[PDB]
């Protein structure tokens, strides 16, 4: 298999406007949303059809209850942070947890928190400790590290449970997650040469330009990998043409173990 990852985010807002939820939690497998929950629906719901078809109502009912408790804890945590920062107005609190199953079989695992969109606390599951970015985070670090059992529980969940969930979801959605749609790639002039690819899945792709056989990293403009809306992605890379001297320019595309070269005449 290619590399795959599972991750869950949480978002809390301390003073949201009229309709916006106080709390949102979404899970992903790779780039695909799989689960959602917020403080308005108060229900955990599938975001991918292959999650709905493979997890019985007992699953969604249980995690709905857990998420209602997690929602309340997030509110209490954010209130504490904003009190200790001495901040007025509306502020955000965020969490991300997850794991990666790499092609070679090795694994990674991660857990971190953010306040107002900036790193706040980052878990190290090897040293079993929390990295604090400031003294509000330092106070939380001390309280969390005093509960050593919870640190060990988080290490076990990242290393064993998360990976087991991921393999389970990967089999559920294997028709989506494990398929390959190779890119359609073309070159055009607009003076710079634009190498454009579209129609491809998975979104991971490497496009670069060579000049007479050498890569020119500082000279290349890399476009974002963007969704086209039909399950496939598109991307591009540009390079500026020398009007004083001819050169041998070629676009190089790497995708899912296949390399492609478009030499520009």
């Amino acid at each position: 298999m290619r590399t795959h990852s599972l991750r869950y985010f949480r978002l809390g807002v301390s003073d949201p406007i009229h309709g916006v939820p106080e709390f949102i939690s979404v899970g992903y497998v790779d780039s695909h949303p799989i689960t959602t929950y917020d403080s308005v629906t108060r229900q955990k719901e599938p975001r991918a059809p292959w999650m709905a078809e493979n997890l019985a109502p007992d699953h969604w009912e249980r995690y709905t209850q857990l998420l209602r408790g997690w929602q309340q804890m997030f509110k209490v945590e954010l209130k504490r942070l904003q009190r200790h920062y001495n901040h007025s107005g509306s502020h955000t609190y965020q969490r991300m947890i997850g794991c990666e199953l790499l092609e070679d079989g090795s694994t990674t695992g991660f857990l971190q928190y953010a306040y107002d969109g900036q790193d706040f606390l980052i878990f190290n599951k090897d040293t079993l400790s929390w990295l604090a970015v400031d003294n509000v985070a330092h106070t939380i670090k001390q309280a969390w590290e005093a509960n050593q059992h919870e640190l060990l529980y988080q290490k076990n969940w990242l290393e064993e449970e998360c990976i087991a969930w991921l393999k389970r979801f990967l089999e559920y959605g294997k028709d989506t997650l494990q398929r390959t749609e190779p890119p359609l790639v073309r070159v055009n002039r607009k003076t710079a040469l634009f190498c454009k690819a579209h129609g491809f899945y998975p979104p991971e792709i490497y496009m670069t330009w060579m000049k007479n056989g050498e890569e020119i990293v500082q000279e290349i403009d890399y476009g974002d990998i963007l969704p086209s809306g039909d399950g496939t992605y598109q991307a591009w890379a540009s390079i500026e043409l020398d009007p004083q001297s001819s050169n041998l320019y070629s676009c190089h595309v790497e995708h899912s173990g296949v390399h492609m070269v478009l030499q520009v005449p």
Partner: antibody
């Protein structure tokens, strides 16, 4: 999903006893031991989630995730250790699954 | 600092009679639980309350109902008692739920005997 522990064990005062708990569960988020004196409430004894042995006074609790096995070790048994010992495991959905308990009888 | 306080300690009931068991905690816990303990088997969850304002069935909810009245109180209701509900009932609480290492704190237990 099953949690198994012996119904009853009998040991002599001053000796050592090892109470086994094996579990088969859908996922694993930790194993708990609780002490329950007859007619009283269970109270929390230990929590294990990584492999190895943790010590707390005369009691130690061991965990092997790969073997799906824990034991509660009581050293230097006293009469006040006569009680039931409950093991319990949190599964992948954070459901606590309780073993039926081991009644420990101590011979003075 | 009473911990978990449940009542009554003992109760005889006739089949068909209604009963409410009370439970309060003064530990500012968010999660509360109602278990029954019977010979030869582990504790079985009847109903639980992950947080104030939500409750849900456990493993053996039939014949029972609950009310998370506030953050402190979690009452258990036997609307029409049956002999099968002869048991010792335990209320418990934890700081949160969905947290692997947090332990349960138990009340003293309530012994119900339901008779024809």
């Amino acid at each position: 999903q099953n949690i198994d522990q012996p119904t009853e064990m009998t040991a002599t005062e001053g000796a050592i006893v090892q109470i086994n708990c094996t579990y088969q569960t859908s996922g694993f988020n930790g194993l708990f031991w609780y002490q329950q004196h007859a007619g009283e409430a269970p109270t929390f004894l230990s929590y294990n989630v990584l492999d190895g042995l943790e010590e707390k006074g005369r009691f130690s609790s061991f965990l092997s995730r790969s073997k799906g096995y824990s034991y509660l070790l009581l050293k230097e048994l006293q009469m006040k250790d006569s009680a039931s010992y409950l093991c319990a495991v949190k599964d992948s959905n954070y459901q606590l699954i309780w073993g039926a308990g081991t009644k420990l009888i101590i011979k003075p | 600092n009473a911990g978990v306080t449940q009542t009554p300690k003992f109760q005889v009931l006739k089949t068909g009679q209604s009963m409410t068991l009370q439970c309060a905690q003064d530990m500012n816990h968010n999660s509360m639980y109602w278990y029954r303990q019977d010979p030869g088997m582990g504790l079985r969850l009847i109903y639980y309350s992950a947080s104030e304002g939500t409750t849900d069935k456990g493993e053996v909810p039939n014949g029972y109902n609950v009310s998370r009245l506030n953050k402190r109180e979690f009452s258990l209701r036997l609307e029409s008692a049956a002999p099968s509900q002869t048991s010792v009932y335990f209320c418990a609480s934890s700081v949160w739920t969905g947290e692997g290492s947090g332990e349960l704190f138990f009340g003293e237990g309530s012994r119900l005997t339901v008779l024809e």
